[PDB]
Design an enzyme around this catalytic site. Structure first.
Site, mmCIF file in Angstrom:
data_model
loop_
_atom_site.group_PDB
_atom_site.id
_atom_site.type_symbol
_atom_site.label_atom_id
_atom_site.label_comp_id
_atom_site.label_asym_id
_atom_site.label_seq_id
_atom_site.Cartn_x
_atom_site.Cartn_y
_atom_site.Cartn_z
ATOM 1 N N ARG A 179 7.546 -5.265 2.158
ATOM 2 C CA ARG A 179 8.459 -4.285 2.751
ATOM 3 C C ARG A 179 7.746 -3.468 3.848
ATOM 4 O O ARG A 179 8.289 -3.191 4.931
ATOM 5 C CB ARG A 179 8.963 -3.370 1.641
ATOM 6 C CG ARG A 179 10.066 -4.086 0.862
ATOM 7 C CD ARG A 179 10.488 -3.326 -0.374
ATOM 8 N NE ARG A 179 10.990 -2.010 -0.085
ATOM 9 C CZ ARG A 179 11.246 -1.112 -1.056
ATOM 10 N NH1 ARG A 179 11.040 -1.390 -2.339
ATOM 11 N NH2 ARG A 179 11.770 0.084 -0.755
ATOM 12 N N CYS A 240 7.095 6.530 1.513
ATOM 13 C CA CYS A 240 7.502 5.233 0.985
ATOM 14 C C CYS A 240 8.922 5.006 1.436
ATOM 15 O O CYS A 240 9.194 5.231 2.622
ATOM 16 C CB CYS A 240 7.369 5.195 -0.560
ATOM 17 S SG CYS A 240 8.290 6.455 -1.471
ATOM 18 N N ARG A 241 9.881 4.571 0.628
ATOM 19 C CA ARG A 241 11.250 4.402 1.084
ATOM 20 C C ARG A 241 11.988 5.745 1.049
ATOM 21 O O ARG A 241 12.639 6.104 2.023
ATOM 22 C CB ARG A 241 11.897 3.336 0.164
ATOM 23 C CG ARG A 241 13.426 3.297 0.033
ATOM 24 C CD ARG A 241 14.140 3.070 1.374
ATOM 25 N NE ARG A 241 15.549 3.060 1.073
ATOM 26 C CZ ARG A 241 16.227 1.964 0.716
ATOM 27 N NH1 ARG A 241 15.633 0.777 0.597
ATOM 28 N NH2 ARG A 241 17.506 2.096 0.333
ATOM 29 N N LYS A 242 11.882 6.512 -0.032
ATOM 30 C CA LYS A 242 12.652 7.745 -0.161
ATOM 31 C C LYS A 242 11.883 8.892 -0.811
ATOM 32 O O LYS A 242 12.491 9.772 -1.392
ATOM 33 C CB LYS A 242 13.907 7.459 -0.962
ATOM 34 C CG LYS A 242 13.695 6.893 -2.373
ATOM 35 C CD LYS A 242 15.009 6.581 -3.113
ATOM 36 C CE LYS A 242 15.278 5.103 -3.092
ATOM 37 N NZ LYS A 242 16.412 4.810 -3.944
ATOM 38 N N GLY A 243 10.544 8.937 -0.757
ATOM 39 C CA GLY A 243 9.763 10.026 -1.339
ATOM 40 C C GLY A 243 9.471 9.883 -2.814
ATOM 41 O O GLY A 243 8.893 10.801 -3.392
ATOM 42 N N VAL A 244 9.816 8.751 -3.462
ATOM 43 C CA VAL A 244 9.583 8.616 -4.907
ATOM 44 C C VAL A 244 8.271 7.911 -5.273
ATOM 45 O O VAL A 244 7.375 8.565 -5.841
ATOM 46 C CB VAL A 244 10.787 7.877 -5.583
ATOM 47 C CG1 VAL A 244 10.532 7.634 -7.081
ATOM 48 C CG2 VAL A 244 12.042 8.740 -5.464
ATOM 49 N N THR A 245 8.037 6.632 -4.972
ATOM 50 C CA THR A 245 6.759 6.028 -5.354
ATOM 51 C C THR A 245 5.556 6.616 -4.604
ATOM 52 O O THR A 245 4.415 6.531 -5.065
ATOM 53 C CB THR A 245 6.862 4.532 -5.131
ATOM 54 O OG1 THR A 245 7.158 4.314 -3.771
ATOM 55 C CG2 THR A 245 7.945 3.938 -5.994
ATOM 56 N N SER A 267 10.765 9.969 4.200
ATOM 57 C CA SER A 267 10.209 8.644 4.102
ATOM 58 C C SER A 267 10.829 7.602 5.055
ATOM 59 O O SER A 267 11.404 7.964 6.099
ATOM 60 C CB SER A 267 10.325 8.242 2.637
ATOM 61 O OG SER A 267 9.188 8.626 1.860
#
Length: 286
Positions: A179, A240-245, A267
């Site tokens: 990704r 990352c994609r949305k601030g989670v991982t 992100s």
């Protein structure tokens, strides 16, 4: 920042959860796999409340799982019986051992609460080890919690855009390699290309966990940042994609001794919708 299943099970048995120790299930899963809220209602560590990521966020934002206001966080956490003096322990039941639980640990700290821990091994290992679970409702006394945004621990769009010329912060992306490279699509979206902000280093979040679901040792985590030449004495933003991982890099760095990794909460999702296309690259050519 890490509590063991053993420690949490002894505290549950001795009846220590309540105003001074609150436990949160922070589970969330993609549309069409598991239903987190329902799974909670059916089995949870005794005394644990559910922290809903879908609720405690900025609902008016077009971008994914953005922080709520200080007041919005304060009210939600207060209703779960958490005060400023409470030690909070967060777990989630993902197959990997930990997926959303680092996001919630960071959320408490970006709102000024330092006494928060992640259950090392998650609910997956609580279950594997046969520790007790209930369906009965956790109904805590309301408490007053005072949130103060801790601006050092967050980065906004503008701050990440200014960093592209100034290079004052290392930017590390926690998404899976395909990704980050642009060779694999972004899930759960229509028309969002994959790819990465020019200048970020990739450290796939899942590599901080052992196949059993536990966090790797500080020794190993240190060795992981050294091999990607990420200097832990210098400023570092995780995205990352949305601030989670991304919060798994904050957590891993925290266990190596660096307590101030900031998270770019917008992100990739925000970046792709707002940034000039020249600021990111993809092997899918666009």
């Amino acid at each position: 920042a890490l509590v063991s299943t053993k420690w949490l099970a002894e505290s549950v048995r001795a009846g220590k959860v309540g105003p001074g120790l609150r436990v949160l299930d922070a589970s969330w899963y993609s549309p069409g796999t598991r239903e987190a809220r329902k799974e909670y209602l059916e089995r949870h560590v005794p005394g644990a409340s559910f922290f809903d990521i879908e609720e405690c966020r900025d609902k008016a934002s077009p971008y994914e799982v953005m922080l709520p206001s200080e007041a919005g966080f304060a009210d939600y956490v207060g209703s779960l019986g958490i005060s400023n003096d409470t030690h909070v322990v967060v777990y989630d039941g993902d197959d990997l051992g930990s997926f959303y639980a680092p996001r919630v640990w960071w959320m408490f700290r970006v709102f000024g609460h330092r006494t928060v821990s992640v259950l090392n091994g998650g609910f997956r290992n609580w279950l594997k080890e046969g520790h007790p679970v209930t369906s009965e409702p956790s109904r805590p006394e309301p408490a007053i919690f005072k949130a103060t945004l801790n601006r050092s621990l967050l980065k906004t769009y503008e701050q990440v855009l200014e960093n592209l010329e100034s290079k004052r912060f290392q930017l590390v992306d926690s998404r899976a390699q395909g990704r980050y490279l642009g060779t694999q699509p972004e899930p759960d979206a229509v028309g969002l290309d994959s790819g990465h902000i020019r200048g970020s280093v990739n450290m796939p979040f899942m590599n901080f966990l052992t196949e059993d679901g536990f966090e790797k040792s500080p020794e190993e985590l240190r060795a992981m940042f050294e091999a990607k030449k990420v200097d832990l004495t210098k400023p570092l933003i995780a995205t990352c994609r949305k601030g989670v991982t991304a919060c798994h890099i904050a957590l891993a760095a925290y266990l190596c001794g660096k307590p101030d990794v900031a998270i770019y909460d917008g992100s990739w999702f925000e970046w792709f919708h707002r940034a000039p296309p020249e600021t990111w690259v993809s092997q899918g050519k666009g």
